[PDB]
Amino acid sequence: MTRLSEILDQMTTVLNDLKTVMDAEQQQLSVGQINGSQLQRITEEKSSLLATLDYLEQQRRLEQNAQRSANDDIAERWQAITEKTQHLRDLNQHNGWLLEGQIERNQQALEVLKPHQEPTLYGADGQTSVSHRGGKKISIVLFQGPSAGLVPRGSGGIEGMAQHGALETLKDLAEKEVDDAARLLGEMRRGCQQAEEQLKMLIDYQNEYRSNLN
């Protein structure tokens, strides 16, 4: 009766850091302002800390074979994990919604700055509203931005139009909109995908652990 105590302690402390990290990025996605240096450091922390959760997770199952409970320490850590992983999975679902919403918002913004050169509608304004699960559409703009939705806080999304202008040569500001958003929000989209997946599955199998009585 040991080892799990350390692993689950390492999980829960990383989940405290991920509480701060994943909530902080989620905030900057829902405000609508994507901060480059800030989100780069935040998502770097998230993805490293998730890789850590992942190694501790697979090893935890190896320690469900190697060790078991008969210990309250492991049990306190266990409850701390299920709580934090649940809250993280929830705000992560919201985080991914904010991403795909802010990414598609970016692609309509690119449509508005870009001149209509091929048979499209118009770079109009709009204030749509969406607050359910979904997102992930085709690449709306000529850049790789396959996302959909809107940030519920930033209620000002344009109609779900898509161009087909697959030709380019020189950009300036639009390239930095795609660079900053599609790269940062992309690494958070893939990172958060892995996050909510491993966290919901964590909790799912986690009931396998018994209290001190075993």
Torsion of CA 81, 84, 86, 87, to 10 degrees: 180
Residue at 17 is within a domain: yes
146: β partners: 139
Q: How far is the CA of 120 from the CAs of 13, 21, 69, 160, in angstroms?
A: 51, 40, 63, 12
Tokens (6 digits) for 132: 């359910």
Q: How far apart are CA 107 and CA 162, in angstroms?
A: 9
Residue 157 counted as domain residue: yes
Domain presence at residue 194: yes
DSSP-H helix ranges across 67-173:
72-113
Q: Rounded to an integer, what distance in angstroms lies between the CA atom of residue 114 and that of residue 127?
A: 20
Method: NMR
Residues paired with 139 in a beta bridge: 146
Residue carrying structure tokens 């989940």? 15
Is residue 211 assigned to a domain? no
* 212 belongs to a structural domain: no
Residue 112: CB partners within 8 Å, gap ≥ 6? 123, 124, 125, 158
Which helix (DSSP H) or strand (DSSP E) does residue 57 occupy? helix 36-66
Please check whether residue 171 lies inside any domain of the structure: yes
Q: Domain residues for 142? A: 4-206
Query: Residue 213 domain-assigned?
Result: no
Q: Would residue 214 count as lying in a domain?
A: no
Determine which helix (DSSP H) or strand (DSSP E) holds 8, and give its type and residue range. helix 4-30
Q: Domain tally for the chain?
A: 1
d(Cα 180, Cα 172) in Å, to the nearest integer? 13
